[PDB]
Amino acid sequence: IHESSKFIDQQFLKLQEIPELVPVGEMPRNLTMTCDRYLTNKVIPGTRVTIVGIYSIYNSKNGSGVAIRTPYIKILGIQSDVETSSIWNSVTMFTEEEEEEFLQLSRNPKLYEILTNSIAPSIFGNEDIKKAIVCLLMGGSKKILPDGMRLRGDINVLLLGDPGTAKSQLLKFVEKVSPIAVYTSGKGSSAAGLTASVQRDPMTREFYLEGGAMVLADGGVVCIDEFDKM
Amino acid sequence: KSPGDNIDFQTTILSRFDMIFIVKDDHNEERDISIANHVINIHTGNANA
Amino acid sequence: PLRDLDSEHVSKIVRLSGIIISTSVLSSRATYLSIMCRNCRHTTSITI
Amino acid sequence: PNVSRTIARELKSFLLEYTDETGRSVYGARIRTLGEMNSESLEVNYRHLAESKAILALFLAKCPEEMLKIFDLVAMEATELHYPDYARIHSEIHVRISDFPTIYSLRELRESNLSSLVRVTGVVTRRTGVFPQLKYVKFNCLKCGSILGPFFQDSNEEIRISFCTNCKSKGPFRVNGEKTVYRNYQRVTLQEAPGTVPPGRLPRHREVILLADLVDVSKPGEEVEVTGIYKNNYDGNLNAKNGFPVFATIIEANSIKRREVFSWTEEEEREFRKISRDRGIIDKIISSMAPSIYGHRDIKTAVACSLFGGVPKNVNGKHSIRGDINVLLLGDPGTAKSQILKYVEKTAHRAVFATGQGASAVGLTASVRKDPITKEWTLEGGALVLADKGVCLIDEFDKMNDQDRTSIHEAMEQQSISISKAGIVTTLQARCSIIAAANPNGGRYNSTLPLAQNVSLTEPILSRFDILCVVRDLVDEEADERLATFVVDSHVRSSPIPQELLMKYIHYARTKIYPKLHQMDMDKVSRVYADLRRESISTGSFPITVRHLESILRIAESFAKMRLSEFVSSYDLDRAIKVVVDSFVDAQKVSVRRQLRRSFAIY
Amino acid sequence: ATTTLTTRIPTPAIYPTEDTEGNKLTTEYGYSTFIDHQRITVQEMPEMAPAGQLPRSIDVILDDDLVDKTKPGDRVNVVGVFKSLGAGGMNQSNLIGFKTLILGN
Amino acid sequence: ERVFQISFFNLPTVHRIRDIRSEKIGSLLSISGTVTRTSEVRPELYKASFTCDMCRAIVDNVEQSFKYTEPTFCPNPSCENRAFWTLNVTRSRFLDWQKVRIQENANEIPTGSMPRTLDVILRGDSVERAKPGDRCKFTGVEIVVPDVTQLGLPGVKPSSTLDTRGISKTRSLGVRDLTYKISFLACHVISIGSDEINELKEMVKDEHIYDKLVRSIAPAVFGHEAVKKGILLQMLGGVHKSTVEGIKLRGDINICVVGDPSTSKSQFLKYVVGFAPRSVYTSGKASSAAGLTAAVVRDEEGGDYTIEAGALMLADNGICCIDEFDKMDISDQVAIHEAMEQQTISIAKAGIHATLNARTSILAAANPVGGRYNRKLSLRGNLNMTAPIMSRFDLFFVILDDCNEKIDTELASHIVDLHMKRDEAIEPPFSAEQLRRYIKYARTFKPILTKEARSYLVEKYKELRKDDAQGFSRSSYRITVRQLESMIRLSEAIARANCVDEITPSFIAEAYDLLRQSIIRVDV
Ligand SMILES: Nc1ncnc2c1ncn2[C@@H]1O[C@H](COP(=O)(O)OP(=O)(O)O)[C@@H](O)[C@H]1O
Ligand SMILES: Nc1ncnc2c1ncn2[C@@H]1O[C@H](COP(=O)(O)OP(=O)(O)O)[C@@H](O)[C@H]1O
Ligand SMILES: Nc1ncnc2c1ncn2[C@@H]1O[C@H](COP(=O)(O)OP(=O)(O)O)[C@@H](O)[C@H]1O
Ligand SMILES: [Zn+2]
Ligand SMILES: [Zn+2]
């Protein structure tokens, strides 16, 4: 009697040994992993995790040995590195003792000259650059005009010169400080594109947005280098 | 004809970037000591840290 | 590490780490079901 | 058969009696060490019990599977009086039969060899599983409130039971996974080694079972010898064989040996300290970097510094400075450029011998891609992920496409490789050093043009290499006196620090030593730089730049690691500055020769 | 299973090729009545999606009416009952759980 | 402890397997062809114990070829069902069993038909006497074997049924389809296709035999002593294991033959494949890496996987005639060069990884970019094969042609004089009847260097390489250490060729002059 019955969600995960440390001679091995109720959807593929679990045994309808079973883990709880990479998830719910001190920081007069002193511990000179980069991370006049023809608030900055002189380095620190920063290059990178790539899902053959820096970086700065090689 | 881009790229650089900064200066004898002695103070003795 | 998993300590609690590759679908399982006999017109309930 | 009672007490008497050298009862050592390490395995020599009573060795050869019923009980019986309640934590002892005489080629195993003990040769390939499977079996029962007690499981076949302790009943029995206990099982492919196959035939291959925690004690691509019992493996799904009833055979492995982990220890570490203080080991280490040629120290000095690397550091949570030293090896194709890094693939740890595209175990790309078995999906990382701590060795660096070039460039640029494919988004650490081998465009070095014009590669991928090593032709009566003799000596015959200490000394340093530099007098680097920097712009076309100065510190500290110093010595820089300037100057046009004299001021 | 929201007792009636009395029969095709069946599979709208992840999709069954008013690639809102029908695993023999779908109203 | 195998051999006739006819089923027959695969030697059940599940009674007397499961009597007649049994794996006989695949002889295929294949099976001590890739002869039984895939073929298929007459009131009707293939079962195998030493000794004692061999290693070709030496030397090895480290070396010799078209360079490859027993020939356009390197058959027919005798795994210990070399692709030439950067070959598919042995020489015929040989270019530019695969060739032979009337009339005569029936125009000093067996005596000779030779050899590499000072006249390619290594492994070839165990430098001077002759002019 389905209309007087109660049901729950469970999920199948696969975990594999991190490819940074595996035998040179062969592929990594992996474990079928399962979880139930509120433990579902807590984790995103490609995050780094520790699982606490029951290493358990089941029978697989293979087609494996003369008499055998397959291992699996029932997750009974999970935790992670605090957030893997940059993910569109973010926190707006700052605490009362943060607004208190951000307001007090706003009431320093030197605040602009403090950030230009702050946004670069190492880099020497190049004030006329760092000053502009401070202006970048703040966005700008996002304007939803009534005809819909909005204008960008963000700003675009180009570094040009002979190598050295931090023209590549200055992006690396920006990828630390800025919310949802992404660091890529011309021609994209290994297994990543610069711009939105579409392809079929190998199973169920569904078109979907695979990825790209401009797609992940929704809501922040994109760092690009070798911009001639597009 | 050539590999990669073409002079057309002269547009997207000047038209679509809100600032372009051109940053080369020429081997000034005191500058390459100033930056060097700062960069030494990076690698160890952590004085900048 | 998975490399050190063994038939030793099967069904103990284990702590291990890796990368999640994939996350499949939120399949649906019961926790209460109510059941009637199609001939006895007789009702029970089961919980898990 | 009750005769086994006679065999048991005979071998019980053997194990405890057997004195052979110095009169010692060596099995007391074999079993106490068995116990205190919680070893499941005893080690047994065929020559010893055969020298005692050959009928044991015959019975073992004829019908080992039944004979091994007796050994494990007797050894546990001896073990339990040696260690009371050892039976609590360990259920039984396996015996590793060893030193078995009749080695066969994997070809000639045939009809009579099965059900008998055999020693066989092959290469380990296709390790699959570590899975559990039954050893102690118990079942639930539905129609009564209690289980079926313990049944042992024979490896070859399943079991069935009717009886129940409360009832005789039809309804199902099912495995009580609340108690059932499992051995370790693995499937291995064994292949005849290439170098022992007669002309034109193909290496026959067999499927091998490893048990009893002998899982994960070999890794594929090494020659392995095993003791085991060969058998026809009837296991169902066999009536489907049309035509003749022809049975798939298997070997079950008792013992497995790698001879035909490496690590630093108290009794060995300290001799490196005294050696590390003995008289200028660096140029003695440069000699042991290449046994097969006379060669030339200018490449070897670069390779040694990559093998020790530098020190990674950060400026309060950011500003990563690369610990890795990267090398480009270049010169006319006839000069040795693959063989030297082929030695590195031996001598290094976590080191990979990558090649672009085919005939390569790793393609220099991080990827998500098929695996056939179960259509399993997993990442294959690039070699730069597989070697994240150590070094990636790239052969024919020029001969690569777009994708397998952007990968290395992204790794050098920022030491982490993106993934954003197949629905997985990750950045993988690629903190790996490089030795790259390349060839000039047209083979001849064409010394009248700069390196960036001689090679096809452009300056910024070329500049991520701090050290460029070059060799040209040598026409004169040196090479034809030396080189021909070292070459012909290699065919005619069919001072350095020994290799095993050398490969041990790199790993002992890197896992311990982080040599600082203290800013008492190091400022002079800026003075020498302030000279050499300015003076190359005026007379030469290409610049010297902070990226070079950066590498001087990180090359100097490598010799401090090789010295095992607490901090950078004032003349570790003197080694490094010569090693940098003879990278830059040799990279220029022949018109550079002025800069040899100008730099000789410090040389 | 798709004509009532409540799990009516199943009635696996047998198509009548013989009369109660035993006579032959013939079929009056078009005095019989028919209805259109369709299922359409809906996946999350890609601009609201937390991009990078895989698509996830569910099966919608349409009775006679709405069959004509969907086509692939259009942005569509559906309302209905997310029934969880059949009895997989717990009946018959063996895992994957119940077949879940929306009755599109 | 007793089993027998019996063979009849030397039957009066050979029947080409295209003329297999079902009128011969179960009869003795004589067959020959090419073995295309072998397979894992396996146990065949033969006599086995069968035990009742109902009582401890057993039977060992067997029904075994097919129907191998159901003896009709239990040694106590009463059972709650008498007919059915279980086997035993412990008390059984077994015999070694093998399948090999045999292919029609390319000398006798029909016009336009493909080289027919059929399956032939081995029992007992005849097992492991077939070898892939070579001519074989057989005798044995014209067996037939059930085949299912003949469903969907035209014509009625005979179906058996159990009758229904004289039993009453007791696929339930009892029916079967009996459709068969025609394999073969062979009892005998041989690898088809005294006063000898009194000839072998007699030739090596004579002073000229080397020069006789040079003008008889390809009797019909006119001139071209250079390539004749090269091929004769190519049939002879050099010590591959010549290292202390426990890594081997490229002891074998590789050759490329080059020149404008209508050179007879292609004839050599036909002569070699006609003469060298471990040789095979490829057009080099019509090829794939998966046909040169061994393929795999994916775990089919209920056995495990099997390896398919690729053309370059075959021609172990010998020559592969790669005609029109340059029309190969990047894929398969790199597959070659990965099989020359190592003697070994490695294969991956389906997770099954195999490393094959290989050790081979290649004889390559190649053509310039425009066919016409550009005298005024280096061989790298003219030949258009990338430097790594242009490396690892001990020599290149280059031919250039023009009217030289004193020769052209002798050549024209040689061509037309050849067209008189089997005439002696190409009569050598001596024929293959001793040449092949002498080469085997030369192979197992394994000769060695000498002190004065090595000390003198070190100066001839200076002499050679000095010619590249003032270079680019009578010089057209770079000289490096591999030319010394080439020169070493030619030293064994002549030492084998002369059957001299311990060489002298005055013979190595002839190999040196061959390396010299191989070089070419360029415009200043
Ligand atoms: N202003 C600077 N302060 C400190 N270090 C610098 C500065 N400019 C360049 N460097 C040095 O340059 C290296 C980074 O090179 P970078 O300029 O980022 O590469 P690219 O030339 O491709 O931009 C660092 O090792 C750093 O020490
Ligand atoms: N001086 C030498 N002594 C001994 N062997 C040498 C010497 N020079 C070159 N070789 C051999 O030649 C080979 C050089 O090949 P390599 O230059 O690496 O190929 P590529 O030019 O295609 O990269 C090495 O394997 C080495 O064994
Ligand atoms: N010296 C020679 N001896 C025998 N045949 C020759 C000779 N020179 C040319 N030929 C002729 O060349 C033909 C062989 O073809 P070939 O010239 O090898 O083609 P390709 O030049 O494309 O390899 C034969 O028909 C033969 O008559
Ligand atoms: Zn019961
Ligand atoms: Zn019976």
Side-chain angles (χ1 to χ4, degrees), chain D residues 5 29 35 191 203 213 233 245 250 274 335 338 352 362 366 374 411 413 419 458 545:
Chain D
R5 296 176 66 188
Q191 181 180 0
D213 195 75
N233 201 162
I250 288 176
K274 277 73 176 175
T335 51
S338 178
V352 175
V362 59
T374 60
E413 187 171 0
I419 294 167
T458 183
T545 305

Side-chain angles (χ1 to χ4, degrees), chain F residues 208-236 267-277 319 363 397 426-432 434-436 438-439 497:
Chain F
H208 285 163
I209 61 166
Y210 179 84
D211 294 331
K212 301 288 190 179
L213 288 168
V214 171
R215 68 186 179 88
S216 69
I217 189 61
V221 177
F222 181 78
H224 297 288
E225 293 177 353
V227 173
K228 288 181 183 178
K229 290 183 284 186
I231 298 166
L232 181 63
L233 294 169
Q234 187 168 1
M235 295 181 74
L236 298 174
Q267 291 184 353
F268 296 100
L269 284 64
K270 279 73 176 174
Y271 185 80
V272 170
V273 70
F275 177 77
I319 295 164
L363 192 150
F397 292 94
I426 62 172
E427 185 181 2
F430 59 93
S431 65
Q434 54 170 349
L435 200 143
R436 291 189 299 270
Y438 174 64
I439 289 163

Side-chain angles (χ1 to χ4, degrees), chain D residues 307-512:
Chain D
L307 269 73
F308 288 93
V311 179
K313 295 184 73 66
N314 297 111
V315 180
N316 204 162
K318 68 282 187 189
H319 184 80
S320 179
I321 58 94
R322 186 172 67 248
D324 292 331
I325 288 95
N326 297 312
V327 178
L328 182 64
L329 297 174
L330 182 62
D332 56 352
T335 51
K337 293 183 286 293
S338 178
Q339 182 64 259
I340 295 90
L341 54 87
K342 188 182 285 185
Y343 179 75
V344 174
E345 190 273 330
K346 182 174 74 176
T347 302
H349 182 276
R350 191 177 288 107
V352 175
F353 177 74
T355 300
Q357 292 85 15
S360 310
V362 59
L364 293 173
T365 60
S367 297
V368 176
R369 181 181 291 172
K370 284 178 74 175
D371 292 325
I373 191 70
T374 60
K375 297 292 181 186
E376 205 264 325
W377 293 103
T378 53
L379 284 71
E380 294 294 330
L384 301 165
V385 177
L386 182 62
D388 172 70
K389 186 261 176 67
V391 63
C392 178
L393 305 173
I394 296 166
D395 57 354
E396 290 90 4
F397 185 77
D398 293 330
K399 297 292 186 184
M400 276 92 82
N401 295 315
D402 290 330
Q403 66 276 19
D404 58 354
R405 185 176 292 170
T406 60
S407 63
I408 193 70
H409 185 195
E410 185 64 27
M412 296 187 291
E413 187 171 0
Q414 64 92 24
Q415 302 301 324
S416 177
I417 296 167
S418 67
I419 294 167
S420 296
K421 183 175 179 181
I424 189 166
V425 293
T426 306
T427 62
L428 293 176
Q429 298 294 317
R431 294 180 290 114
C432 180
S433 297
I434 297 93
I435 297 166
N439 292 320
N441 295 117
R444 185 62 60 87
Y445 183 73
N446 202 163
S447 299
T448 60
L449 295 170
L451 192 148
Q453 185 64 256
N454 189 0
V455 76
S456 66
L457 298 169
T458 183
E459 185 176 1
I461 186 166
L462 185 65
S463 68
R464 296 289 184 276
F465 296 91
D466 60 356
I467 297 163
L468 281 70
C469 294
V470 177
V471 297
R472 299 177 179 179
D473 191 359
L474 293 174
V475 182
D476 62 354
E477 186 62 27
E478 182 177 2
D480 290 333
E481 181 64 25
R482 62 183 185 85
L483 189 152
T485 58
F486 292 93
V487 168
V488 75
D489 184 75
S490 66
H491 298 280
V492 170
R493 296 286 183 273
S494 180
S495 286
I497 293 165
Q499 297 178 359
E500 192 273 331
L501 293 175
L502 179 65
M503 66 188 288
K504 184 64 73 75
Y505 186 69
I506 58 178
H507 185 75
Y508 180 76
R510 292 180 67 183
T511 60
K512 292 177 72 69

Side-chain angles (χ1 to χ4, degrees), chain D residues 107-111 114 125-126 156 189-207 230 232 234 238-239 241-249 332-335 342 346 353 355 358-359 372-373 375 395-396 399 439 442-444 473-477 479-481 483-485 487-488 490-494 499, chain F residues 38-45 64-66 68 87 89 94-98 121 123 125 127-128 130-132 143 145 185 241-245 248-249 278 298 301-309 313 316-317 338 341 344 346 350-357 386 449 454 457-459 461-462 465 469 472 478 480-482 484-485 488:
Chain D
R107 297 186 296 276
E108 189 57 27
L109 297 171
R110 299 280 188 270
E111 68 275 18
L114 61 85
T125 60
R126 186 176 176 273
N156 60 3
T189 301
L190 187 62
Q191 181 180 0
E192 181 64 27
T196 60
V197 177
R201 287 184 181 88
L202 286 167
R204 298 288 184 270
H205 68 277
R206 301 291 183 183
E207 184 179 1
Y230 180 82
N232 56 359
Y234 184 81
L238 289 167
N239 196 0
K241 178 68 175 177
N242 295 117
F244 293 168
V246 174
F247 288 165
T249 62
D332 56 352
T335 51
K342 188 182 285 185
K346 182 174 74 176
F353 177 74
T355 300
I373 191 70
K375 297 292 181 186
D395 57 354
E396 290 90 4
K399 297 292 186 184
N439 292 320
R444 185 62 60 87
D473 191 359
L474 293 174
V475 182
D476 62 354
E477 186 62 27
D480 290 333
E481 181 64 25
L483 189 152
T485 58
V487 168
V488 75
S490 66
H491 298 280
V492 170
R493 296 286 183 273
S494 180
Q499 297 178 359
Chain F
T38 61
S39 66
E40 61 185 1
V41 176
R42 291 183 283 177
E44 190 273 329
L45 181 62
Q64 59 88 30
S65 181
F66 185 68
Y68 65 89
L87 77 168
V89 295
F94 292 108
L95 58 89
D96 55 356
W97 183 84
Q98 184 182 6
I121 293 163
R123 289 189 292 107
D125 292 331
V127 176
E128 77 258 15
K131 188 176 176 181
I143 196 164
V145 173
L185 194 150
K241 65 182 182 181
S242 177
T243 64
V244 298
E245 181 60 25
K248 294 185 283 187
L249 297 169
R278 280 76 174 279
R298 189 176 175 180
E301 292 89 5
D304 293 331
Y305 64 89
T306 306
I307 299 164
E308 188 273 331
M313 184 281 297
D316 281 331
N317 289 111
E338 295 293 328
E341 290 181 353
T344 61
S346 65
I352 58 94
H353 291 173
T355 302
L356 297 172
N357 189 4
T386 183
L449 288 175
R454 62 182 179 86
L457 186 152
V458 171
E459 184 63 26
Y461 181 77
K462 190 263 180 180
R465 192 176 71 189
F472 295 96
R478 290 188 298 276
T480 185
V481 173
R482 295 184 180 89
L484 188 147
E485 291 290 328
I488 293 166

Side-chain angles (χ1 to χ4, degrees), chain F residues 157-218:
Chain F
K157 275 75 71 177
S159 296
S160 66
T161 189
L162 63 89
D163 61 355
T164 184
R165 296 176 66 187
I167 295 168
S168 66
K169 187 60 72 178
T170 60
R171 60 182 187 275
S172 66
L173 183 63
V175 56
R176 186 178 65 190
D177 191 0
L178 64 156
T179 303
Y180 298 106
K181 66 180 179 181
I182 300 165
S183 63
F184 186 72
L185 194 150
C187 65
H188 185 268
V189 180
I190 191 67
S191 177
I192 192 68
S194 177
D195 192 74
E196 295 85 2
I197 188 167
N198 293 321
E199 185 62 25
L200 296 175
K201 299 293 288 185
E202 182 174 1
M203 61 185 293
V204 297
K205 296 292 181 185
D206 294 330
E207 63 271 19
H208 285 163
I209 61 166
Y210 179 84
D211 294 331
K212 301 288 190 179
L213 288 168
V214 171
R215 68 186 179 88
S216 69
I217 189 61

